[PDB]
Design a binder for this molecule. Structure first.
Ligand SMILES: Cc1cc2nc3c(=O)[nH]c(=O)nc-3n(C[C@H](O)[C@H](O)[C@H](O)COP(=O)(O)OP(=O)(O)OC[C@H]3O[C@@H](n4cnc5c(N)ncnc54)[C@H](O)[C@@H]3O)c2cc1C
Ligand code: HEM
Length: 383
């Protein structure tokens, strides 16, 4: 059952008002919920995302995007958004009963904001929208959990190897420290790793899995000088115990391969190399015949994380080319910004982007201007 005929005109008429009030409703929703359920800050919600504010708007904002979608495309869902959210939720171990929690505090905040304007017709219609989306996500998350090799949401790992590989990137290898079986990861997937803040709150962050033994989880963490957890993760000593989630994510090598022989173009900046290296290592293990073009940006070659390993893996591919651009020093294959018009990208190529939001926005724009189909551009936001 999709969006009811009764609710459609109400959602249609109130969508602008609701979208306008979302930034105001969000902090009240979270403030109320996290006062009643402080346990949810100790292992689930990111304190930094609450303090930044804009980030935390995504939950309610996706509800507005969803409402607009089901009005334009009835009995269908924005599957890309649902899949991304479900994989994140599964990484964080979200259980279906908590959708009742979010409903309670979200709609309480709607009531507080709108006051007497929150009449039954409006609350009824938006409640229907909420539960359509919640049910879809719950169903996706249930299927994700069924794929795992274990029945937990995170398990204890020991840090067995730690290497400072650039001025601000630490390459970390973990192995299980309890007897929980590991789910095999797919190239491009990430894990959530957990540590406590200085004042004792458990907090997760996501990192892309890197080539390792099947008995290991390997990640490369770039220091965010204005973030809370990367300093904590990078200061763990060998032997430290941290919890790691099961692996998830829908931005995998299979997602980029639309047909058996389509070429791949992988474009990254900074620590956005991490899915690229995962993809290249897998393609090399598969003895892929695809044409693979890798364009990586860094401030300098010395600051390019994992460049040596990426180049070694790329040498194993039949038809791979790697080009590094340097944006501060002049030692790259090229200097300055990637100019995609110079690239010969055919209409059957898939293009993958991973870098800072601004970098990806400019690349996506210039790709579209150069005639690359939006449907062929795939991206991975780190945050
Ligand atoms: C799928 C996925 C894969 C990822 N893979 C990698 C990877 O391989 N390597 C990697 O290095 N990272 C990766 N990331 C990013 C990573 O998950 C973290 O976002 C990143 O490491 C920053 O974490 P942090 O705790 O240091 O920053 P956070 O504490 O989360 O802060 C992030 C930003 O929030 C703002 N902020 C923080 N505190 C406040 C405050 N008090 N007030 C206002 N604003 C504030 C700042 O602008 C800050 O830069 C990935 C993310 C995702 C979603
Ligand atoms: C219909 C209900 C919900 C919707 C539409 C929704 C939507 C979203 C979206 C869009 C994101 C960002 C995904 C991304 O980063 O790409 C997100 C992240 C997140 N969600 Fe959900 N969500 C819902 C329910 C819940 C519930 C019930 C919980 C827990 C009680 C929860 C906890 C989280 C957490 C912890 C994050 C990580 C970001 C953060 O720490 O703030 N969500 N959600």
């Amino acid at each position: 059952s999709g969006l009811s005929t009764k609710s459609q005109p109400v959602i249609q008429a109130t969508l602008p008002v609701i979208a306008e009030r979302i930034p105001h409703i969000t902090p009240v929703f979270y403030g109320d919920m996290l006062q009643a359920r402080p346990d949810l800050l100790d292992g689930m919600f990111s304190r930094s995302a609450q303090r930044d504010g804009t980030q935390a708007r995504a939950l309610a904002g996706s509800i507005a995007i969803f409402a607009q979608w089901i009005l334009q495309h009835p009995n269908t869902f924005p599957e890309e958004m649902l899949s991304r959210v479900a994989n994140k939720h599964a990484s964080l171990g979200l259980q279906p009963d908590e959708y009742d929690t979010v409903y309670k505090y979200l709609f309480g905040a709607i009531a507080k904001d709108l006051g007497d304007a929150a009449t039954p017709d409006i609350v009824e219609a938006w409640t229907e929208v909420y539960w359509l989306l919640a049910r879809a996500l719950i169903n996706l998350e249930r299927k994700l959990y069924a794929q795992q090799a274990n029945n937990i949401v995170r398990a204890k790992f020991k840090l067995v190897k730690r290497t400072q590989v650039t001025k601000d990137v630490v390459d970390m290898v973990f192995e299980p420290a309890d007897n929980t079986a590991m789910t095999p990861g797919k190239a491009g997937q990430y894990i959530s790793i957990y540590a406590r803040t200085s004042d004792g709150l458990l907090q997760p962050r996501q990192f892309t899995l890197l080539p390792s033994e099947e008995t290991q989880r390997r990640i490369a963490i770039k220091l965010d000088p204005h973030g809370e957890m990367t300093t904590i993760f990078q200061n763990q000593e060998v032997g430290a115990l941290l919890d790691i989630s099961n692996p998830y994510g829908d931005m995998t090598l299979e997602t980029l391969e639309t047909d058996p022989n389509s070429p791949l173009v992988l474009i990254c900046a900074g620590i956005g190399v991490t899915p690229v290296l995962a993809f290249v290592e897998k393609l090399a293990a598969q003895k892929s015949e695809r044409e693979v073009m890798i364009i990586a940006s860094s401030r300098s070659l010395a600051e390019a994380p994992l460049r040596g390993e990426l180049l070694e893996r790329a040498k194993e591919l039949k038809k791979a080319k790697v080009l590094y651009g340097t944006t501060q020093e002049k030692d790259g294959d090229f200097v300055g910004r990637i100019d995609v018009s110079t690239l010969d990208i055919p209409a059957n190529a898939s293009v993958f982007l991973c870098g800072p939001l601004k970098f990806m926005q400019e690349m996506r724009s210039h790709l579209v201007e150069a005639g690359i189909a939006k449907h062929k551009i795939f991206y991975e936001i780190f945050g």
